[PDB]
Amino acid sequence: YNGKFKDKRGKVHTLVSIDSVAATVGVGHAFPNVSMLGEANNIFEVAYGPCPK
């Protein structure tokens, strides 16, 4: 995965990285795949709230 984004200040943020580690060193993240569980997926969730209006 080679995703990367830029901040308003021009700072480049690489999606796949470990804090305080040189970019030259290989790095990766591991996780299990749960998408197929659908409505029973209790491991990953996102919350949403109201606005001040």
Next chain:
Amino acid sequence: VSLLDAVDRDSRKAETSAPERVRQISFPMMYFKEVESITPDEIQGVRQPGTAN
């Protein structure tokens, strides 16, 4: 009006009454005002005193 004074018959003198007095006046009036407002922060997550949830 006031009492009347006796005069001699032959002198043929008399009395007279002064005229009335008229006057005028004016009044100001009092003004009252007050303000109040309602904002969303008064109803965002604020429980009603007499209930549970």
